[PDB]
Amino acid sequence: ANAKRIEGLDSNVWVEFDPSVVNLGQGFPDISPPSYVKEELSKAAFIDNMNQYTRGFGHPALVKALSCLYGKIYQRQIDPNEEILVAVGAYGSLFNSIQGLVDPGDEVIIMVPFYDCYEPMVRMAGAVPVFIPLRSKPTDGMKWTSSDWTFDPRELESKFSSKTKAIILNTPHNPLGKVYTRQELQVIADLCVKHDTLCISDEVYEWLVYTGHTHVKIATLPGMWERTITIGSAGKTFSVTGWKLGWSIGPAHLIKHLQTVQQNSFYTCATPLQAALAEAFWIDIKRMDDPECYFNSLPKELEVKRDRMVRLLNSVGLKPIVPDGGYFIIADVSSLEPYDYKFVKWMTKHKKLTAIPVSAFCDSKSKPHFEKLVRFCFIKKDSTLDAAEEIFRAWN
Amino acid sequence: ANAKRIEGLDSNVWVEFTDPSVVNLGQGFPDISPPSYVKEELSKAAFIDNMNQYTRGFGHPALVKALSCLYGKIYQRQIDPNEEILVAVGAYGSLFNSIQGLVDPGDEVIIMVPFYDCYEPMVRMAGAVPVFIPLRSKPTDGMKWTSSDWTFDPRELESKFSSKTKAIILNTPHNPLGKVYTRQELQVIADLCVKHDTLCISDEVYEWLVYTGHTHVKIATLPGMWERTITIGSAGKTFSVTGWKLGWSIGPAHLIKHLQTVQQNSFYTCATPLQAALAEAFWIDIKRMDDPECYFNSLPKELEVKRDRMVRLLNSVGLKPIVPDGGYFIIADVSSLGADLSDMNSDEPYDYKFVKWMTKHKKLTAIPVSAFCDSKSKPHFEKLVRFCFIKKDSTLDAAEEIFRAWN
Numbered sequence: 071a072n073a074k075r076i077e078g079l080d081s082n083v084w085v086e087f088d089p090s091v092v093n094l095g096q097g098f099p100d101i102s103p104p105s106y107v108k109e110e111l112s113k114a115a116f117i118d119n120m121n122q123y124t125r126g127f128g129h130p131a132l133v134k135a136l137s138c139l140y141g142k143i144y145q146r147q148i149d150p151n152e153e154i155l156v157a158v159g160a161y162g163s164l165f166n167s168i169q170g171l172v173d174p175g176d177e178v179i180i181m182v183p184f185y186d187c188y189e190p191m192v193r194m195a196g197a198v199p200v201f202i203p204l205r206s207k208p209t210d211g212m213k214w215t216s217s218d219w220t221f222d223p224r225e226l227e228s229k230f231s232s233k234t235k236a237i238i239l240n241t242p243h244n245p246l247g248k249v250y251t252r253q254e255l256q257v258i259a260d261l262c263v264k265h266d267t268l269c270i271s272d273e274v275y276e277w278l279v280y281t282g283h284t285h286v287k288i289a290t291l292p293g294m295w296e297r298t299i300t301i302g303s304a305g306k307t308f309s310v311t312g313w314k315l316g317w318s319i320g321p322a323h324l325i326k327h328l329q330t331v332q333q334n335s336f337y338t339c340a341t342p343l344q345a346a347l348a349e350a351f352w353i354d355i356k357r358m359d360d361p362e363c364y365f366n367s368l369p370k371e372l373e374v375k376r377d378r379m380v381r382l383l384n385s386v387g388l389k390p391i392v393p394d395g396g397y398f399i400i401a402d403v404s405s406l407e408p409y410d411y412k413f414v415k416w417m418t419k420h421k422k423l424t425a426i427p428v429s430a431f432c433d434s435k436s437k438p439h440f441e442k443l444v445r446f447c448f449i450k451k452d453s454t455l456d457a458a459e460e461i462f463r464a465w466n
Numbered sequence: 467a468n469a470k471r472i473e474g475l476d477s478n479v480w481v482e483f484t485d486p487s488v489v490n491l492g493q494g495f496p497d498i499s500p501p502s503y504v505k506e507e508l509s510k511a512a513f514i515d516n517m518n519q520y521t522r523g524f525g526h527p528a529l530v531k532a533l534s535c536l537y538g539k540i541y542q543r544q545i546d547p548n549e550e551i552l553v554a555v556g557a558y559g560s561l562f563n564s565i566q567g568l569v570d571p572g573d574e575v576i577i578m579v580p581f582y583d584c585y586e587p588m589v590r591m592a593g594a595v596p597v598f599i600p601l602r603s604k605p606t607d608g609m610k611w612t613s614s615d616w617t618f619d620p621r622e623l624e625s626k627f628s629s630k631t632k633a634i635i636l637n638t639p640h641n642p643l644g645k646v647y648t649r650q651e652l653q654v655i656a657d658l659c660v661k662h663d664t665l666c667i668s669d670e671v672y673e674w675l676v677y678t679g680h681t682h683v684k685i686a687t688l689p690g691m692w693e694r695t696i697t698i699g700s701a702g703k704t705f706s707v708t709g710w711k712l713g714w715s716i717g718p719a720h721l722i723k724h725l726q727t728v729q730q731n732s733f734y735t736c737a738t739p740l741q742a743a744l745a746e747a748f749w750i751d752i753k754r755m756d757d758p759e760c761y762f763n764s765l766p767k768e769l770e771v772k773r774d775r776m777v778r779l780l781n782s783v784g785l786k787p788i789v790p791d792g793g794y795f796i797i798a799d800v801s802s803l804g805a806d807l808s809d810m811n812s813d814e815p816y817d818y819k820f821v822k823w824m825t826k827h828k829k830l831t832a833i834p835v836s837a838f839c840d841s842k843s844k845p846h847f848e849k850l851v852r853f854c855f856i857k858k859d860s861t862l863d864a865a866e867e868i869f870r871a872w873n
């Protein structure tokens with residue numbers, strides 16, 4: 071018998087989803103992590119102290135590294151102890167944020183399609199998710215891209231009331247690949263300031279922005295530092311999704327409440343992973359300048375792979391939406407229980423290729439508007455994408 | 467402002483407890499080496515690319531398979547790795563899953579005092595009402611003071627159960643007392659849980675650390691209890707790697723699913739390389755469970771020696787130790803020292819003053835037992851200080867130097 075708070079929250083999209091099938095579904099990198107990330111974990115393993123309890127809110131060496139890296143991005147001095155919290159992934163950071171800040175009866179605005187945990191997390195806190203969809207614009211004629219999706223500022227305004235506690239922002243966006251523009255962020259900022267709401271900004275894909283786009287942090291916009299929690303992830307930054315380390319960065323008067331959730335929930339994150347992650351950070355922080363920096367080299371490597379996926383999807387009559395950022399690409403499926411779920415089962419069984427139906431990232435009323443869209447992951451090794459080529463070449 | 471569910475829960479004893487020349491017998495920080503193979507296995511896992519990516523949400527398959535094998539032997543029943551186990555971020559996370567998945571606002575949860583400090587705020591964050599009952603000492607055998615001289619009154623316990631009781635939290639072996647609950651004590655608890663149809667959440671992280679004359683009994687193995695108990699263990703304790711932060715909840719499928727629902731909506735998955743390495747460590751020791759060199763046997767054997775040394779050290783200065791049946795903490799009554807605390811003028815309990823004094827004057831820290839007590843219980847336990855002995859010989863040598871030079 072569940073507690074009331076988790077009523078109806080037991081179904082989970084990922085819980086629902088053959089070894090000759092090429093999996094382009096889940097965000098499971100099969101490229102290697104950088105060699106030094108692995109080496110540093112090995113080194114921490116052999117130090118006895120690095121196997122025992124560390125500082126609860128974050129390993130001192132790690133919060134110092136994050137302080138120094140993010141202080142450069144933000145152009146401010148970030149207090150490593152008071153303005154940072156290390157949690158169990160971005161998931162954990164998100165949970166800390168909602169649990170510590172959002173009351174039963176609060177409204178939380180979510181942009182659709184949304185990364186799927188946003189909705190049940192808001193609901194577990196007894197809050198009301200208030201949905202607004204991203205919508206299409208006329209294309210430049212040439213190609214379909216993430217930047218051809220935006221939101222209507224007037225519709226957004228109408229979502230804000232005196233019940234609104236916060237808006238959840240995700241840039242670069244999953245599943246669309248949208249890198250939100252400065253002007254878009256400014257509309258969100260104006261409304262958070264005018265209504266005095268929080269912004270929770272999920273920026274795990276922050277390094278993964280392609281040619282002609284720039285990651286901009288809403289927390290750097292005038293008046294936003296004081297009302298924003300910005301979230302990062304080791305799993306994305308260093309392609310080690312299995313390390314489950316993320317962080318929240320923001321003002322002390324907000325971070326302390328995340329800290330209260332953490333000390334009362336899981337308390338401490340793993341010492342060896344955090345020690346190794348601190349060293350991985352120092353290596354790359356010292357060479358941000360250079361194309362060898364993993365912050366530089368990975369987006370560069372992935373852009374090639376993105377462009378590859380777009381050719382392959384085109385090659386078979388699937389209309390790709392070229393992503394500004396991240397490592398997912400959506401394809402419209404229409405020119406070949408919701409449509410995209412049926413299509414994905416059909417493509418698995420008959421083409422030996424798997425993907426994720428976009429309707430999984432949509433509230434019930436929005437699903438008809440997105441149900442002909444399917445998402446593919448390209449943070450894959452050359453050999454994996456060749457196996458995918460084979461499947462596409464052989465499709466007809 | 468904070469969310470309402472966390473009002474007044476921002477204070478934390480461990481945060482409150484913050485110098486290189488101080489000998490630290492306070493926090494449960496092991497400075498013995500963990501087993502060599504535990505460290506080896508994490509290194510091995512680090513170099514496998516796959517073991518650095520997402521694994522199964524509710525627990526890495528090899529880990530839960532190892533857990534089901536080991537606990538199947540202990541429970542003498544088949545344990546389902548997927549449906550009857552949930553791997554969480556430490557025993558903390560397991561406790562959190564349990565209370566968050568199973569306990570409603572207005573529910574009562576019975577807690578035994580002193581209690582591992584997190585029990586109280588976890589119950590309050592869920593909007594539930596902690597109902598406290600103290601452990602009470604009884605006359606000693608004359609020669610020694612032990613954990614076994616502490617117990618609860620069964621009639622007092624009974625009176626805490628009402629139609630509003632959702633659960634009782636059991637911690638055995640007990641922190642901070644070191645008490646190993648007897649079959650008869652567990653039987654009293656089981657009787658009431660069955661009579662009122664309540665849950666039992668049983669924190670058994672120290673399950674392997676039981677000393678001569680005592681045996682770890684799992685309440686969930688008693689008649690009627692399997693269907694109503696969540697039993698919690700921890701890698702930090704099992705393998706002396708407190709920094710790995712992996713624990714597990716074991717119980718019936720209809721209860722574990724609720725815990726699994728909290729986890730999927732909170733942090734989701736635990737780290738892959740730690741879980742992979744831990745599985746291997748378990749196999750290495752599962753396969754030699756009958757042998758002295760099994761870590762499950764050698765660690766309590768090694769700790770029993772250290773415990774006895776600590777008892778002697780505390781005695782030499784006039785501290786009155788409570789010899790623990792289990793775990794790696796020891797409590798001493800400090801009141802026969804009548805210490806020079808005259809002018810530390812706060813409204814803090816005696817034991818916190820004593821510890822501050824001991825740290826400054828004697829260069830030795832410990833933990834005040836009142837940190838493990840609710841407001842009304844503090845005066846009944848405030849002359850008691852907790853010392854940790856999961857320590858290497860050289861650390862206890864340093865401690866011994868201080869005790870010898872004490873007067």
Ligand SMILES: Cc1ncc(COP(=O)(O)O)c(CN)c1O
Nearest residue numbers: 097159160161185244303305316
């Ligand atoms: C937008 C978004 N946020 C959060 C997460 C979870 O991050 P973590 O693995 O660090 O918990 C993911 C998973 N790839 C994601 O796509």
Ligand SMILES: Cc1ncc(COP(=O)(O)O)c(CN)c1O
Nearest residue numbers: 494556557558582641700702713
């Ligand atoms: C009784 C008890 N329960 C739970 C914990 C926390 O366990 P973990 O470190 O596995 O989260 C501790 C701390 N050692 C403890 O003493």
Ligand SMILES: [Ca+2]
Nearest residue numbers: 231232265266
């Ligand atoms: Ca307002």
Ligand SMILES: [Ca+2]
Nearest residue numbers: 467468473474
């Ligand atoms: Ca308050």
Ligand SMILES: [Ca+2]
Nearest residue numbers: 543544545546
């Ligand atoms: Ca079975």
Ligand SMILES: [Ca+2]
Nearest residue numbers: 628629662663
């Ligand atoms: Ca009842």
